[PDB]
Symmetry: C2
């Protein structure tokens, strides 16, 4: 669920997701459209695609468990849905971490009006 | 949404919600029933009741903004639904903080089978 996802982002990046990953670029936030502005934004695009590929699940609300082994996120053994949702979230958190090096505050609060370009397909 | 709720619990209590408030007593977790075991558990019961009183909203998934003024949680100015959801979450986070003093690890992983008592009404 989004509860676990927020904690996972914080644990993996060191950044509060509400201030760094909630209104960024064209995809990190509500109503994603157009093309990703940078690598960080593309993490959000790919996460949206991952959730969209799970119509038989409830990715935002279905709780799951995770932990760490050797510093790394390990998803718990849950239902098929919980496992798939957790893997979407894990992939995204690791993507944010790997792309911290090109994070740019200039894309915070980027206006949706400038994302009115043909939306990239998953 | 649950994303904000998790961050709010962490910020207010200092505790990871996934390890302290996700499998506790009869109500802090999935499928709450019976009677709250202690004050902390009753925070979860009341939060469930608060969300249940918002059938015209989507409390688990509707994102909102919050911040702090003088150390205290202040909900952002959103839709009526966002405002109401945020106030449910704020109340719960502050309830957890106020009842840290009676938190008991013995109620972690409390079995649902022992909560098969007539469920308290909201």
């Amino acid at each position: 669920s989004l509860l676990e996802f927020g904690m996972m982002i914080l644990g993996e990046t060191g950044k509060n997701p509400l201030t760094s990953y909630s209104f960024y670029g064209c995809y990190c936030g509500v109503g994603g459209k157009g093309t990703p502005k940078d690598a960080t934004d593309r993490c959000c695009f790919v996460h949206d695609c991952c959730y969209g590929n799970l119509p038989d699940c409830s990715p935002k609300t279905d709780r799951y468990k995770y932990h760490r082994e050797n510093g790394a996120i390990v998803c718990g053994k849950g239902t098929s849905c919980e496992n798939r949702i957790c893997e979407c979230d894990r992939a995204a958190a690791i993507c944010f971490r790997k792309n911290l090096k090109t994070y740019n505050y200039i894309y915070r609060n980027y206006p949706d009006f400038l994302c009115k370009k043909e939306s990239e397909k998953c």
